[PDB]
Write an enzyme that holds these catalytic residues in place. Structure first.
Site, PDB file in Angstrom:
ATOM      1  N   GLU A  52      39.988  46.970  45.640  1.00  0.00           N
ATOM      2  CA  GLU A  52      39.947  46.034  46.746  1.00  0.00           C
ATOM      3  C   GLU A  52      40.731  44.796  46.324  1.00  0.00           C
ATOM      4  O   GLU A  52      40.155  43.826  45.826  1.00  0.00           O
ATOM      5  CB  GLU A  52      38.501  45.654  47.087  1.00  0.00           C
ATOM      6  CG  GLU A  52      37.710  46.728  47.844  1.00  0.00           C
ATOM      7  CD  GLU A  52      37.183  47.844  46.953  1.00  0.00           C
ATOM      8  OE1 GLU A  52      36.553  48.785  47.492  1.00  0.00           O
ATOM      9  OE2 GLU A  52      37.391  47.780  45.720  1.00  0.00           O
ATOM     10  N   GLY A  54      43.646  42.738  50.579  1.00  0.00           N
ATOM     11  CA  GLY A  54      43.255  43.943  51.285  1.00  0.00           C
ATOM     12  C   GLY A  54      42.953  45.083  50.330  1.00  0.00           C
ATOM     13  O   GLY A  54      42.966  44.900  49.117  1.00  0.00           O
ATOM     14  N   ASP A 101      45.870  49.865  34.588  1.00  0.00           N
ATOM     15  CA  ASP A 101      46.005  48.417  34.489  1.00  0.00           C
ATOM     16  C   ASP A 101      45.477  47.993  33.123  1.00  0.00           C
ATOM     17  O   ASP A 101      44.772  48.757  32.459  1.00  0.00           O
ATOM     18  CB  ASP A 101      45.285  47.686  35.643  1.00  0.00           C
ATOM     19  CG  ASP A 101      43.782  47.933  35.677  1.00  0.00           C
ATOM     20  OD1 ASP A 101      43.078  47.649  34.695  1.00  0.00           O
ATOM     21  OD2 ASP A 101      43.303  48.407  36.715  1.00  0.00           O
ATOM     22  N   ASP A 130      48.333  33.987  39.893  1.00  0.00           N
ATOM     23  CA  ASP A 130      47.035  34.599  39.686  1.00  0.00           C
ATOM     24  C   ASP A 130      47.076  35.750  38.702  1.00  0.00           C
ATOM     25  O   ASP A 130      46.502  36.805  38.954  1.00  0.00           O
ATOM     26  CB  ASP A 130      46.445  35.055  41.030  1.00  0.00           C
ATOM     27  CG  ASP A 130      44.972  35.461  40.926  1.00  0.00           C
ATOM     28  OD1 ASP A 130      44.228  34.893  40.093  1.00  0.00           O
ATOM     29  OD2 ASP A 130      44.553  36.351  41.681  1.00  0.00           O
ATOM     30  N   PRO A 137      44.234  40.517  33.784  1.00  0.00           N
ATOM     31  CA  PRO A 137      44.386  41.896  33.306  1.00  0.00           C
ATOM     32  C   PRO A 137      44.525  42.940  34.438  1.00  0.00           C
ATOM     33  O   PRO A 137      45.284  43.895  34.302  1.00  0.00           O
ATOM     34  CB  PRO A 137      43.124  42.113  32.462  1.00  0.00           C
ATOM     35  CG  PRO A 137      42.855  40.727  31.900  1.00  0.00           C
ATOM     36  CD  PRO A 137      43.134  39.819  33.084  1.00  0.00           C
ATOM     37  N   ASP A 178      51.767  42.020  41.903  1.00  0.00           N
ATOM     38  CA  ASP A 178      51.046  41.260  42.909  1.00  0.00           C
ATOM     39  C   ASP A 178      51.179  39.744  42.853  1.00  0.00           C
ATOM     40  O   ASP A 178      50.180  39.036  42.857  1.00  0.00           O
ATOM     41  CB  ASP A 178      49.571  41.656  42.852  1.00  0.00           C
ATOM     42  CG  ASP A 178      48.837  41.373  44.155  1.00  0.00           C
ATOM     43  OD1 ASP A 178      49.488  41.361  45.211  1.00  0.00           O
ATOM     44  OD2 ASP A 178      47.610  41.185  44.121  1.00  0.00           O
TER      45      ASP A 178
END
Ligand SMILES: CCC(C)(C)[C@H]1CCc2n[nH]c(C(=O)NC)c2C1
Length: 295
Positions: A12, A16, A83, A124, A127, A142
């Protein structure tokens, strides 16, 4: 979308839901972020995001497409298999080997040097938005736009946003972020990979701020000119003495500790740039190891 088949929810995201999806036509596997828009269309915000498509670098996750349709904004990202958060958790008992930590830090700084030279800030880093692959690469993903979508107190899912990697100037209410905010976050991430524990795990803005103060010392005009005139600075802030740095990231050699201290300077102007950080002696023996990934 209709030309995509969800494989599984990657998470999430901050705006979105994110799905691992297959481009039914091309067979391409991607990470698809869906942002719900409520009525007023964010033209500005949308154009900013779209410019991110030209931001191509080996240490930046490629933003393949940006689709605005049916009051939804879709971001199609190239897919990476894991990730850094999951990798760090999976490496918690043994720790990530230093050569790999150093390789990851080096690559992330190359990525930041690149976006920063193009006037792009992430804002922002954490990790969760650092993605790795089987070949030893790690990429920034992102990029946020406080310059538009600002900073939602909670992601679209009412979920709690992590403050652990937030630079002090942001916490003190600075209206203008500089590339220095990303260096701070990366410093916090570097420390975490090294110690296997979040450096500043705050559970509120003030707790975040005070944890930083307890470790690096409450800032004053001497180390941070202008700090006392910052929007959210209160002369009533407790005055903590700076902690001996050798206590902060013990397993780290002096080269690593000196670079980290430079990434964590209070004054955004004293904080080292990504470019200068790449020249730091800590990277004299940098190599590119292969991580052991369980996918
Ligand atoms: C908000 C977008 C986030 C969730 C950070 C995605 C950015 C782009 C991306 N690509 N692969 C992955 C992935 O997670 N794979 C296992 C992501 C994560």
């Amino acid at each position: 979308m209709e030309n995509f088949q969800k494989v599984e929810k990657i998470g999430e995201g901050t705006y979105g839901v994110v799905y691992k999806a297959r481009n039914k036509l091309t067979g391409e596997v991607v990470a698809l972020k869906k942002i719900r828009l409520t009525e007023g269309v964010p033209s500005t915000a949308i154009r900013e995001i779209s410019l991110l498509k030209e931001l191509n670098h080996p240490n930046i996750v490629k933003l393949l497409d940006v689709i605005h349709t049916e009051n939804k904004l879709y971001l199609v990202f190239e897919f990476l298999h894991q990730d850094l958060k999951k990798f760090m958790d999976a490496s918690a008992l043994t720790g990530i080997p230093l050569p790999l930590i150093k390789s990851y830090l080096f690559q992330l700084l190359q990525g930041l040097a690149f976006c920063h030279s193009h006037r792009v800030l992430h804002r922002d880093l954490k990790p969760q938005n650092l993605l790795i692959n089987t070949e030893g690469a790690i990429k920034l993903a992102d990029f946020g736009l406080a310059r538009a979508f600002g900073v939602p107190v909670r992601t679209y899912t009412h979920e709690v946003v992590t403050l652990w990697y937030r630079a002090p100037e942001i916490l003190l209410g600075c209206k203008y972020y500089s590339t220095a905010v990303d260096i701070w976050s990366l410093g916090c991430i570097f420390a975490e990979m090294v110690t296997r524990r979040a450096l500043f795990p705050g559970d509120s803005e003030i707790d975040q701020l005070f944890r930083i103060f307890r470790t690096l010392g409450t800032p004053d005009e001497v180390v941070w000119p202008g700090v006392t005139s910052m929007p959210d600075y209160k002369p009533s802030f407790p005055k903590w003495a700076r902690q001996d740095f050798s206590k902060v990231v013990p397993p780290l050699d002096e080269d690593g500790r000196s670079l980290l201290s430079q990434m964590l300077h209070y004054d955004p102007n004293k904080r080292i740039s990504a470019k200068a950080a790449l020249a730091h002696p800590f990277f004299q023996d940098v190599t590119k190891p292969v991580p052991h990934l369980r996918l």
